[PDB]
Amino acid sequence: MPYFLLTQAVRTGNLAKFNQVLDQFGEKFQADGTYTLIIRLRHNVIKTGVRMISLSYSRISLADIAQKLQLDSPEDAEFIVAKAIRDGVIEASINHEKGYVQSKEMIDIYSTREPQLAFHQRISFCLDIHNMSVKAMRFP
Amino acid sequence: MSEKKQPVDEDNWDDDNVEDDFSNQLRAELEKHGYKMETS
Amino acid sequence: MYEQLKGEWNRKSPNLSKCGEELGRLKLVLLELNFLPTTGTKLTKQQLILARDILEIGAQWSILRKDIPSFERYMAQLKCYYFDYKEQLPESAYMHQLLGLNLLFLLSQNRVAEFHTELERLPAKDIQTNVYIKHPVSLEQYLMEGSYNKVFLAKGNIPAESYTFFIDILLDTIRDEIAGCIEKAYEKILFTEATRILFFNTPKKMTDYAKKRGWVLGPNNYYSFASQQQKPEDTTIPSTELAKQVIEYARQLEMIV
Amino acid sequence: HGLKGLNSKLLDIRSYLEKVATGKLPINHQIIYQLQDVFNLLPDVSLQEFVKAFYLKTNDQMVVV
Secondary structure (H helix, E strand, O other): OHHHHHOHHHHOOOOHHHHHHHHHOHHHHHHHOOHHHHHHHHHHHHHHHHHHHHHHOOEEEHHHHHHHOOOOOHHHHOOOOOOOOOOOOOOOEEOOOOOEEEOOOOOHHHHOOOHHHHHHHHHHHHHHHHHHHHHOOOOO | OOOOOOOOOOOOOOOHHHHOOOOOOOOOOOOOOOOOOOOO | OOOOOOOOOOOOOOOOHHHHHHHHHHHHHOOOOOOOOOOOOHHHHHHHHHHHHHHHHHHHHHHHHOOHHHHHHHHHHHHOOOOOOOOOOOOOOOHHHHHHHHHHHHHOOOOHHHHHHHOOOOOOOOOOOOHHHHHHHHHHHHOOOOOOOHHHHOOOOOOOOOOHHHHHHHHHHHHHHHHHHHHOOOOOOOOOHHHHOOOOOOOOHHHHHHHHOOOOEOOOOEOOOOOOOOOOOOOOOHHHHHHHHHHHHHHHHHOOO | OHHHHHHHHHHHHHHHHHHHHOOOOOOOOOOOOOOHHHHHHOOOOOOOOOHHHHOOOHHHHHHHO
C-alpha cells in the first residue's frame, strides 16, 4: 500500500504529488531500507518521460519534445538529450543542422550470427542434464 | 558533468494499457458468460 | 607531548621541518598505547581527539600546497579513526565539513560509485542537517537530471572557506567531457555557441579549447574532422572455430558417459 | 578420407609442375591451360552476399538441433 502509490507518479508529470507521498509514507520507506531512492528517483522522473517519447517518435524535433513535457521551451528539451545516450537509453543521433533526434531499427539479429551465439550455451546446457542423468542412474 | 547543453531560452501495472484500454462495454459480460445454446 | 600545538596554526604555515616534527609528533601518537582496537583507557583517545585535529589542519596544509595523494592519505586515516573500533567518538565540530571536503574531493573525480556507497552510513546526518553535506548532495540532486552548469549558476553559495581547489577540478571534469561530447555526434558549432552556453564570454577560454583540443576557429566555425570507420567483416574467421564446436557436439554425444 | 585425397592430388600435380617449369619436360598445350581453368572457378567465399547464406541457413539447422 505505500509501494502502491510510489510507481504511479513516475508515469505522471506531477512531482509535488510524489513529494507528498514520500513525506506521507517515508517511515515505511525508511523501514524497508531504501533510503537512497529519492537522491536518484527525481533523476528518472524526467528520464521515464524522454524514453517514452523516443520510443514513440522515430524522428523528434528538439523544438516540440519540450512543450509536451510542460518544459516551456526548446532548450529545456535537450536538457535531457545528452546523457541518456551515454546512459544507454536511446540509439538516436542529433545533427546540428536540424536539431532533430532520429533513431534506427535493428534488423540483423537473424541476418547475422546472433542466434547461434545464444544456442551454444543452451546446447551445452541440455547435454549436461543428459550427463547428470546417466551418471546418477544405475544405483541399483 | 556536461549539463546537456542548451541555447534556446490508479495502479495499473500495464494494467493501464489494459484499464485505459477498458471503459464503456462489458459489465453484463461479467456474469453474462453462459445463456447461449438453445437459440444460438 | 603536544609538540608545537598551535604555533603556525591560523596565520600561515611556511615551515617544512615542522611537518617532520609534526610527523615526529605522529611518531608519538602511534607509540603511546596503540591505534588499531584502542580498547581500554578512554583517555588515550583524548589525544586521538587532537590527533584528528592535527590531521585536519594537515589536510588543510595539503589543500594549501595542492597535494592530492596526501589529502586522501590524511582523510582515510581520519575516517578510520572516525571508525575507531571502539566508536564512542565525542563530537567535534570540524568533522562535518571535513567529510564535505571529502565529498567534494570525491564527486569531482567521477567517483559516483564511491559517492552513493558513502551515504549509506549517515542517514539523517547527511540530509536533515549538516549544510556541508546537504550542499554536495543538493549538488548531486542537481547532478541527476539537467543541472550540471546550473551548478555553476549556484557556484556563489559556499558555506565554508573558498572551496576553489575542487570547483576547479569540477571546472576541469565538466569542460573536458564537454570537449569529448563535441568530438561525438554533436558535429560542429560556431564560436558564439561556445560563448554564451559553455560559459564566460571570451577570456583565454578560447585558448583552452584551441590548445587542449583542436577545433580551430577558422572562417566563422569550429570544424569537425573524420570520426568514422570502415566496418570490415570476414565471418569465416569463425569457420575454423565454429567447426570446433560442432566436433565437440558429436564428441560428448558419442562417448559412453 | 576425403581431404587426404585432396592433398594426394596436389602433391602429385606440383611434382609434374616443378618438372615442366624448369629443365626437362614437354611444355605442350595440354594441361597447362586446361589446369588454368581450374583456377578460374575458386569461389570467393567470404564476400558481400554469401555471408547472408551462412547466417540465414546455418541457424535454421541450429534450431532443429
